[PDB]
Amino acid sequence: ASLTEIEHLVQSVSKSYRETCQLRLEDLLRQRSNIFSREEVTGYQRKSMWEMWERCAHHLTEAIQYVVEFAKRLSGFMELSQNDQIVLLKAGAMEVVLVRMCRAYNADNRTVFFEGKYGGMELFRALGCSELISSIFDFSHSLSALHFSEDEIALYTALVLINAHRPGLQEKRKVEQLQYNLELAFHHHLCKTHRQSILAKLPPKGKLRSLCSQHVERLQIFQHLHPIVV
Ligand SMILES: Cc1c(NC(=O)c2cccc(C#N)c2)ccc2c1c(C1CCN(C(=O)C3CCCC3)CC1)cn2C
């Protein structure tokens, strides 16, 4: 593929991300000073695991929507079979939500944006899954260290979604081609921005997949005991 085709793909993913980023980076950064008081923290910690489950499920479904919209705006995604689209989204939408979380994470105080303010992992005490929440905080902490640009997130999360290795892909060669184009797009933009160094610093492919697997397992248990309608 020619260099203008690669650049166009970079511009496209970058534009698709801008339109589906949920909140602008500037807004998240600004609101870092808007932190929960000790009383608000105590408020959340006193809630039952069921009220906390409802609040986290509401936040995660709002997050998944923007990711679904992001995927729909990706070059060649709509062209795939409904089965192949679903295979890609069921496997990768939650992995993208985990990557996008680094933008609303503040490494200075180890806080996250949740329900209009910033709070530490102590906010999620009532859920009773401190190991899982501590692992999600660790993953966001390691990505925050990379100081990802908005276009770097766009390209990386596009590559999380467009994966030819997903079990159950019918049109596997189409997906292999789209993944190949996006990989040239990602390498090209990193060279143009003098950021090829981040490639080494990225999480091992298995890390994201394993953390998402753990997260979803926990959400499935909560769904079985206390279902929530979309
Ligand atoms: C909320 C959040 C953000 N905020 C955002 O991503 C955010 C919020 C509002 C606009 C935008 C935007 N744009 C981003 C960023 C980093 C985060 C989190 C969290 C939560 C996630 C939800 N929770 C769960 O699923 C538990 C896990 C077990 C079952 C329920 C508890 C832990 C952890 N870290 C590291």
Q: What is residue 106's three-state secondary structure?
A: strand
Q: What is residue 120's three-state secondary structure?
A: coil
Contacts of 134 (CB under 8 A, 6+ apart): 121
Which residue ranges make up each domain of the chain?
Answer: 1-230
Helices (H) and strands (E) in the chain, counts: 10, 3
Span between the terminal Cα atoms of the chain, in Å: 41
* Side chain identity at residue 210, one-letter code: S
Q: How far, in Å, is the centroid of ligand 1 from the Cα of 137?
A: 9
Q: Is the dihedral of CA 192, 194, 196, 202 positive or negative?
A: negative
For residue 115, give the DSSP letter. Answer: T
Q: Which CATH class name applies to 1-230?
A: mainly alpha
For residue 146, give the DSSP letter. Answer: T
Residues touching ligand 1 (Cβ under 6 Å) are: 22-23, 56, 59-60, 101, 104-105, 112-114, 124, 127, 129, 132-133, 136-137, 140, 218-219
* Resolution of the structure in the document, Å: 2.5
Report the C-alpha gap between 24 and 16 in whole angstroms: 13
Q: How was this structure determined?
A: X-ray
